[PDB]
C-alpha cells in the first residue's frame, strides 16, 4: 500500500505529531472503552441482582430456600459520522513549490499534504473536545448556529435526568450564593454504594478567578474541596478550568460504574481513501470522524448555571 498510496504513507509518517485530545483529562483510564461502529445505534444491557428475602439457615432438613433475582436494563447510544474536505498541493507538484526552509505557496495558502492533514486533524480534535464537554457542535464563539444532532447523543453539560442548579443574575457575583447552590446540588447527588471515588470539577475562567478570593486565610476553592471530600469518602478532588465553558460548574465522579465513555474506535480523525485529482496542482482530501458515546446514570452529575441577564 505504501508503494502505491503516497498519501497513506505521509499520514503514517506524520500521524505521531498530532497532540492528544485534552478530553482524556476529564476521565479515568477505566472509564473509556472503544466500540466498533461508524454510524448507527448500539444497545447496551446492564445486569443486576437483588435479594428477595433473608438468607435461609441450613439446619437439619429443609427444601424451601430464599431466592436471588436478576434484572436487566437496555440503553441505546447513537453515533454520528462527520466529514471535512481540505485542499493541498499534489505530490508530483511539491518539488516546484519547495522553497527555502519551507514548502508551499505563501500567496495562495497551499500546503503539502502532510502539513495540511496535521493542521486539519488538530482543529477537528478541538471540535471533538468541545462536543464531549458541552454536547453541542458549533464553530462560533456565541455557540449559535449549532448543528442539529441525533437523540441519545449527549455531553457532560446537557445530559438529562441530572442535578441542575441555577444562580440568579442578581447573585451572579455572590460567591456565597453560588456555594449555597453548590451545596444544595451536592446534597441532591445520589451515588449509592459507589460514593468512595475520586471527583472531578470543571469550571469556567471567571469562576476560577472567583474561587481564589478569601472565604467569607481560607479560600473558596479550599472550602469547596472540603465539601466534596465530605461526600466522596475523602477521595481525591480534581479541579480543571476550560475556556469552552461560560458561567458553568460541572461536578461528577470518576467512577466507571456511574459514568462511562464508549466512543467509536473511529472517533478521532481518519483519512478517507478518496482523493480528488485533476490536471492542475491542487488536490482535495477528506477527513472522517465519529461523535457520540457518553453513558451516565441518573442523578450523578451536578450542573450549576450562573445566569448573567
Amino acid at each position: 500500500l505504501f508503494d502505491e498510496n503516497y498519501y497513506a504513507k505521509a499520514v503514517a509518517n506524520i500521524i505521531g505529531e498530532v497532540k492528544d485530545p485534552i478530553m482524556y483529562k476529564w476521565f479515568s483510564p477505566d472509564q473509556i472503552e472503544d466500540v466498533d461502529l461508524q454510524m448507527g445505534y448500539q444497545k447496551t444491557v446492564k445486569w443486576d441482582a437483588f435479594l428477595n428475602a433473608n438468607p435461609t439457615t441450613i439446619a437439619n432438613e429443609v427444601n424451601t430456600i430464599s431466592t436471588i433475582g436478576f434484572s436487566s436494563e437496555v440503553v441505546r447510544l447513537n453515533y454520528l459520522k462527520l466529514q471535512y474536505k481540505f485542499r493541498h498541493l499534489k505530490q508530483t507538484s511539491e518539488k516546484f513549490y519547495t522553497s527555502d526552509s519551507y514548502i508551499g505557496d505563501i500567496n495562495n495558502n497551499l500546503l503539502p499534504f502532510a502539513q495540511a492533514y496535521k493542521l486539519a486533524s488538530s482543529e477537528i480534535i478541538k471540535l471533538i473536545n468541545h462536543f464531549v464537554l458541552t454536547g453541542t457542535v458549533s464553530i462560533q464563539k456565541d455557540g449559535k448556529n449549532q448543528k442539529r444532532l441525533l437523540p441519545n447523543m449527549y455531553g457532560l453539560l446537557n445530559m438529562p435526568e441530572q442535578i441542575k442548579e441555577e444562580v440568579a443574575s442578581g447573585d451572579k457575583d455572590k460567591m456565597d450564593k453560588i456555594f449555597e447552590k453548590i451545596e444544595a446540588g451536592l446534597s441532591k447527588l445520589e451515588l449509592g454504594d459507589e460514593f468512595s471515588t475520586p471527583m472531578m470539577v470543571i469550571v469556567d475562567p471567571a469562576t476560577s478567578l472567583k474561587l481564589v478570593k478569601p472565604y467569607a486565610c481560607e479560600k473558596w476553592e479550599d472550602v469547596l474541596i472540603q465539601t466534596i471530600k465530605a461526600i466522596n469518602n475523602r477521595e481525591d478532588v480534581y479541579i480543571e478550568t476550560s475556556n469552552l465553558l461560560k458561567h458553568k460548574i460541572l461536578i461528577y465522579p470518576l467512577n466507571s460504574e456511574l459514568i462511562k465513555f464508549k466512543p467509536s474506535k473511529y472517533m478521532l480523525p481518519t483519512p478517507n481513501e478518496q482523493v480528488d485529482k485533476d490536471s492542475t496542482d491542487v488536490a482535495h482530501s477528506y477527513i472522517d470522524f465519529v461523535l457520540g458515546g457518553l453513558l451516565a446514570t441518573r442523578k450523578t452529575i451536578l450542573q450549576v448555571n450562573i445566569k448573567q441577564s
Binding site: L1, V11, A12, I15, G16, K25, P29, Y266, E273
Partner: protein
C-alpha cells in the same frame, strides 16, 4: 498491528485504518500511564 512498528507493512487501506485506530488507542494508554494529576 500499529503504526508505531517499523516492521508493520500495511497491505491495504482497511489495514491502514485499523493501524491508525490501534495507534490512537496506544497513545491514549500511554498518556494515562504518564499522567500525574
Amino acid at each position: 498491528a500499529s503504526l508505531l512498528d517499523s516492521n508493520f507493512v500495511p497491505i491495504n487501506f482497511t489495514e491502514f485504518v485499523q493501524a491508525i485506530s490501534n495507534t490512537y488507542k496506544q497513545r491514549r494508554i500511554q498518556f494515562y500511564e504518564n499522567l500525574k494529576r
